[PDB]
């Protein structure tokens, strides 16, 4: 009954939900929503979005 962490928004999401994506090089990824999956695959930058944690990352990086 473990909560997973999303690779785009950085939030925790509950057991029984979400997606695991696998790349043929073994690298794994975790998504909480089709929104985040789609944005990742199309190439929106999360460091610019004020509802992610990478945004606080970049705010420190300033």
């Amino acid at each position: 009954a473990r909560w997973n962490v999303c690779s785009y928004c950085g939030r925790e999401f509950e057991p029984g939900t979400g997606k695991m994506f696998v790349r043929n090089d073994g690298r794994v990824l975790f998504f909480c929503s089709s929104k985040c999956e789609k944005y990742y695959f199309m190439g929106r930058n999360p460091r610019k979005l004020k509802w992610t944690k990478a945004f606080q990352e970049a705010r420190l990086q300033r």
Binding site: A1, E14, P15, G16
Partner: protein
């Protein structure tokens, strides 16, 4: 020649609108324990849990995702006792006895209640029925019950029903019924965690539908789609017999049918909106409330899987008239997680 099975079943015909929104029970199970053989409540919503598997089969002993339905069950009121005798063909009612003090709202279902009917008259009628049953004429005893929808603020007009009693002695059944009448009855006194149940309700309505969706008919070739016949059947039959056969699929009413399900497992029984997992007391109501149904506040059943009906519909439950041979244990399973996040 190409062979294939026919489209749809003929076992649920005629596919018409149900006679009543309150569902009727036709058959009862044979139980040795002297108890009331069912309960009734209102459907609230769905969630999921993570539990350790119990039932025989592969996956046993592992942590699995399980969908769950919640049914709110306020206590019922027992207002009557009926006696049945054997007539020429089948059973026929011999007589009825009622309680004298009934809620003001019951008159919304039963417009004509007696005028005075005091307690001493009620007791004399009980005595008459007792002596009648004490001879050997009587063959079955049933309870008369009404819901109390006003505790949970859903409505004020109750639903009135009849429920059978288990065992094989009319006198035992009558002693039970006489110790029950005039009082409120709870689901924990009737049901046991871990049982298998049959659920009964009227399904969601969908109005008039065509044969593609009502029977699983195929959509014709794209030439016919451009001709004006895509969602039609080919023909109504052959030259002879020179009439339309009742087995040919046609459009009509879909949904709002009487239906029965088999072998749904009872996971847990809750009280006052709470469930106790590991000493804690957690709320099943998700953040924001159930969609199209508010907060659960009285008592609730957790049933595995899905059940017929819309949200605020009346549900009836009975124990397992047709269970398998490798039942799982009658005991609440080990639950590791219950979801109570927002559902809208």
């Amino acid at each position: 020649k190409i062979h294939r099975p026919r489209r749809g079943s003929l076992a649920y015909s005629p596919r018409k609108r149900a006679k009543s929104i309150v569902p009727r029970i036709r058959s009862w199970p044979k139980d040795s324990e002297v108890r009331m053989l069912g309960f009734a409540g209102y459907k609230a919503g769905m969630t999921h849990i993570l539990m350790i598997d119990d039932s025989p089969g592969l996956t046993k002993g592992k942590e699995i995702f399980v969908p769950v339905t919640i049914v709110e069950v306020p206590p019922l009121f027992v207002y009557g006792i009926r006696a049945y005798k054997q007539g020429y063909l089948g059973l026929e009612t011999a007589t009825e006895v009622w309680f004298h003090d009934l809620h003001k709202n019951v008159a919304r279902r039963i417009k004509t209640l007696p005028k005075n009917y005091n307690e001493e008259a009620f007791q004399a009628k009980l005595g008459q029925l007792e002596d009648l049953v004490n001879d050997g004429e009587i063959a079955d005893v049933r309870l008369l019950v009404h819901t109390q929808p006003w505790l949970i603020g859903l409505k004020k007009k109750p639903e009135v029903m009849e429920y059978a009693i288990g065992g094989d002695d009319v006198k035992a059944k009558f002693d039970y019924a006489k110790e029950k009448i005039g009082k409120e009855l709870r689901a924990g006194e009737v049901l046991h965690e871990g049982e298998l149940l049959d659920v009964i309700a009227v399904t969601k309505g969908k109005g008039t539908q065509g044969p593609v969706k009502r029977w699983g008919v195929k959509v014709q070739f794209h030439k016919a789609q451009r001709a004006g016949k895509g969602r039609h059947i080919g023909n109504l039959g052959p030259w002879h017999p020179a009439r339309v056969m009742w087995t040919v699929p046609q459009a009509g009413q879909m949904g709002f049918h009487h239906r029965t399900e088999f072998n749904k497992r009872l996971i847990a029984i809750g009280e006052n909106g709470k469930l106790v997992l590991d000493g804690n007391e957690i709320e099943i109501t998700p953040k924001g409330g159930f969609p199209h149904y508010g907060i659960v506040r009285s008592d609730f059943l957790m049933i595995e899987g899905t059940i017929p009906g819309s949200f605020k519909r009346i549900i009836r439950v009975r124990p397992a008239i047709r269970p398998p041979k490798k039942k799982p244990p009658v005991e609440r399973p080990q639950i590791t997680y219950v979801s109570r996040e927002s559902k809208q």
